[PDB]
Design a protein around this ligand. Structure first.
Ligand SMILES: Nc1ncnc2c([C@@H]3O[C@H](CO)[C@@H](O)[C@H]3O)n[nH]c12
Ligand SMILES: Nc1ncnc2c([C@@H]3O[C@H](CO)[C@@H](O)[C@H]3O)n[nH]c12
Ligand SMILES: Nc1ncnc2c([C@@H]3O[C@H](CO)[C@@H](O)[C@H]3O)n[nH]c12
Ligand SMILES: Nc1ncnc2c([C@@H]3O[C@H](CO)[C@@H](O)[C@H]3O)n[nH]c12
Ligand SMILES: Nc1ncnc2c([C@@H]3O[C@H](CO)[C@@H](O)[C@H]3O)n[nH]c12
Ligand SMILES: Nc1ncnc2c([C@@H]3O[C@H](CO)[C@@H](O)[C@H]3O)n[nH]c12
Lengths: 237, 237, 237, 237, 237, 237
């Protein structure tokens, strides 16, 4: 066991899908995995392992923010033999042409967190996904007939930002979605020697204030999950 | 309701105790509150409202890290009329004279997060508790026969730090405990005009294994909760 | 002797009161202390040691700014056995509910100096006073019929700041008074393991500009010194 | 004409290959392009336009360093209708398993330059290539039977770095090649609304001190050029 | 009058000499100036105005540190028509070829203060003296048979720095003397459109520690003042 | 030979004039030097060595930007015995009183580059010229009947700045000219123990179009070169 996960080596698959919400992890396990068993509930951070089309797969929540997801991803990598992390989540859009429920794939993640500066002697670390994983997700999406944009996410420390003008800067630089984890997960993957990808569904628009409900985010982002799961199968081949 | 809390105005008391673990919020409500009812379960972040010695009190988890607790504390203050937040958590010690099971009260919180620099034009914001709340907690501890230590916490973004050298720096400058939230909560309190306090119990020494028993650790945890609750009664008058 | 203090161990009390204006030290010695003796004259920074109600107390100016007061406070702590420093000064106010002649006690001190970032590996050190000293001052004021406000000061490097907009930021975050020393003194206290407190009287309101009499100013200054001295006696118990 | 390019709209193809060395641009034009004509020689920064397998293509030097290449790429984008920039260059390796003449494709570029912080309100901008361009280069390489790694480059401001320890940090974080332009080109592409990719050939090893000569770099990195040119043809389809 | 100078326009010459130690102002006035009159006494910072070989000159201490000298130099320039400020002080040396009692002229001043970053949008402002003033001082020294070294000073915020290794960095980059004011004075001069120069005599060698006589110190101090005064006359032509 | 210069020790004089444009290095050699021979052509960065009034002198382009000129200046100093570098360039003006065709001598150079912070432990290094070289240039200009202005340059990383607000800041703090190299050259000179100076002619006003003729601009450029060359002769004695 690790300080935040009460499980043993072998309980997790070598690939783990991770939404922020543990209730969404539960939904994914019930809806997409066969013979799913619960493998963690420490701090209510539910994790499950089962199979998808014969392939062993785990799904576990990571909580909100870089510090939360950094703990869970680290522990999975160092103590549970996890090789790939696929974050499956929600984000807010800043671009006019990005719509609710659009799927975005974060090949890179910008951030206002200090965690990567702490790692990288206060220089600019480009927090990037694993290329093969990105390509796998793009291909899986195309096969499912689901549109997906590939580009930069922005991982925010403050959901309620006191700097509204920064959204104009994100928009200027083509940021596809604002979320709170990607740059941290990519930093952990680099630090601890694993591979990661973040896929998000646009759950709200930062400009229009249109948004999905809590229940919607928990149990209604299915296209993203299919993309993630099918992308793993492509990577296996 | 807010995006992260499915409740309405009035469902929370004007004071909320907040552990990081939602299962610990349930623990506190069941152990210390009468007539407690669950008032939130979005993302599994359990919140409850009940009475302590006739006084309406809420308790709700905040999750791990500054970005997680910043979401919940902001929402409680701006949308649920909450006037006081008391974080009740665990911390690690760096000072040799600070022992396992000491109760630490964070009058200030240092941090390696960028959130307060973002708020404060890249200058140094001293993230501080409300003085009257600190005084109420110190007095409640004294009434219970406990000598709390009052000083600085350090709120870390990385539980698994790559630095390591920073622990010697914390020790040099007298930091009493290392946790992951206080500086963020204090920043939110200042930004939105409310009051906050963090109390922690020392759960480990970034150092040896000083060795206690489960019964003793659990007793001290309960003492921290009693301190928090009694401090509210003192503040009321 | 030290580079800036021509005295020997024992010449200073373990508690030193420090005004910014060196002329105030002699005034304090003659007005409040019994049997005062001169203990320093280097650079005209006169220092005196005497008793207040039998308790050994010293007084010496600190000069304007963090670098000046950092020199004197360091030397006092490391070479003269000083345990407590109480800065007694003036500040400017940014909050409209904070009035001329109000007494402000700096439990914390924000700053635009780099000195604490230099100490603390470029992270945020919360520059804080000693809690008991804060509470002693509050209690001493109350006994004198004075209601002190306790909160954050802002310690400026530039009295004449080219960033006028920073005062609005200070106001938003609840800064009680603007001065030029507290964060530096608190940083030295932490670095060398001693205790400090800054008490200020509001001499100006930054935005507007109202007026006061010389007699009103002396009365208020005397009140602050009385608070400081009585607070020491409470600290001794 | 622009301040650093004496040409007119239409003189450049919508895709420009750019090595740092203008003499290499000359070599590429002579060796790979048909009917090549020189279109710029301001400051000796040679640029040419011709065809590759019927496709109009330009090649022009960009000079050494972020500030130099930022000028040329900006001007091409804003005044010459250039849609894609493919940097074709050299880099130094830090990883043990990366060998001389290996081809590396920079999906991302880390940097110690301040240029992207200036663009991005002092936050972390992940300087990334266009995904389709990366995928095109990977596919072209596979078709040519040439191995290519995809990952992060590091764009240095100082070729002669006073901080040798930073190479250990680059190695730790899996940096594939150290060069001096990629992060700047990616920043310009984002700022001015175009697409970019950097492909490099390992010309020296920072640890082993093995290196290619000046003449070698100028006229002997042919596999990289074929990859770049063939990748354009794939993008056209 | 200004907040720190109780004088009116015309009371100060257009050139002011400023030692750090306020006691030195009266010494300079009595020793070098004719017909001196007292023009300030606020906070014991005595100021005087007289003539040297018929030329109107003022002298007043500036206190220790950038924040102190920044207050006085600003007020002198904006409210008293002062055109030139010459700081005359002491410094510590890090270069072994720089000896006790050497005269150093700061054409530039490095710093670890944040004041110039605050002025200059967080970029690097090169804090420099006025060139003619530098050359005047060099020429005045030469006429007196003194060979002054001209180069960079380092203006420290912390006389007691916790970063001992910075002295090695200063040595490597050719810093001639360490003091606490020059960069601040040069920043004020640029901000308010005036001219400044810092001249220092080496009082200590940071690494080692050799000795000197009181008589040697006064001789060297007098030499520095003579250089400063004669340099003004050269500047007038 | 070095990686960027194909020459051997002795091929360069101990003083090298450096324009940004290699074609301008050829211009200078042909116009002002006798018996000039080309000594470098790697990357088209032409360098030449000849005599001026019997004195051995070299001239070689440095390319645009701090990173480019830092490579060439370092190599000249460490591998070719070069003792003095004189950059001879163009700059843009921000001050209304600084006119087209003024000759500006950079005693200091401000910058938005990070290179000197990397050298100097993230503090402010005042990037300065060699005093004797500045004095020699001023004297040579006077002998030729030109009044050079001596002050700060600003060395920009982005010729095409997204800021724009920074030009007002430069004007406020008295910057004489904006170019792209001086601060980097001065940093290299300090790091490797040599001497440097930057002289520029004002080619544009970041402001209007003041309007000159080609003949007049070219005359002033030649005057700058004459100043540089004659200054060397003065330095020799
Ligand atoms: N507009 C927005 N801003 C920031 N984060 C989010 C999210 C994601 O959802 C959580 C906050 O609601 C957190 O995990 C974040 O990654 N959805 N919409 C967002
Ligand atoms: N040594 C330590 N370091 C960081 N955080 C913690 C904690 C707290 O527990 C959580 C991480 O386990 C987080 O909420 C933090 O505040 N206990 N001990 C800690
Ligand atoms: N509005 C203001 N801003 C900055 N400092 C002060 C002070 C104090 O007075 C001194 C400057 O006049 C300095 O020691 C500072 O702490 N009073 N009012 C102030
Ligand atoms: N070890 C190394 N470090 C930095 N840059 C380079 C290069 C590239 O070559 C140029 C410097 O030689 C410059 O354009 C840079 O991008 N090759 N090898 C390099
Ligand atoms: N080694 C040293 N470090 C810092 N400052 C000084 C000084 C000057 O003396 C004062 C501190 O003693 C201050 O004004 C500073 O400019 N002399 N020697 C010094
Ligand atoms: N307004 C301006 N801004 C930046 N650089 C320059 C220059 C110089 O010319 C080059 C850019 O054209 C570069 O070497 C720089 O130093 N002239 N005018 C300039």
């Amino acid at each position: 066991a690790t300080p935040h996960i009460n499980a043993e080596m072998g309980d997790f698959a070598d690939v783990v899908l991770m939404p922020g919400d543990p209730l969404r992890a539960k939904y994914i396990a019930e809806t997409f995995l066969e013979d799913a068993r619960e493998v963690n509930n420490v701090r209510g951070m539910l994790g499950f392992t089962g199979t998808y089309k014969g392939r062993k797969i785990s799904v576990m929540g990571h909580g909100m923010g870089i510090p939360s997801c950094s703990i869970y991803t680290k522990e999975l990598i160092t103590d549970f033999g996890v090789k790939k992390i696929i974050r499956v989540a929600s984000c807010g859009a800043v671009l006019p042409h990005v719509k609710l429920r659009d799927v975005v794939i974060g090949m890179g993640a910008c951030t206002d967190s200090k965690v990567n500066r702490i790692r990288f002697k206060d220089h600019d670390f480009a927090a990037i996904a694993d290329f093969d994983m990105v390509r796998n997700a793009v291909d899986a999406a195309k096969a499912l007939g689901i549109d997906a944009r590939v580009g930069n996410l922005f991982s925010a420390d403050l959901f309620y930002s006191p700097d509204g003008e920064m959204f104009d800067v994100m928009e200027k630089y083509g940021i596809l979605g604002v979320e709170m984890e990607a740059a941290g997960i990519y930093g952990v993957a680099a630090e601890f020697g694993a591979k990661a990808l973040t896929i998000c569904t646009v759950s709200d628009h930062i400009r229009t204030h249109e948004q999905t409900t809590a229940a919607e985010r928990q149990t209604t982002f299915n296209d993203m999950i299919k993309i993630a799961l099918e992308s793993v199968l492509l990577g296996d081949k």
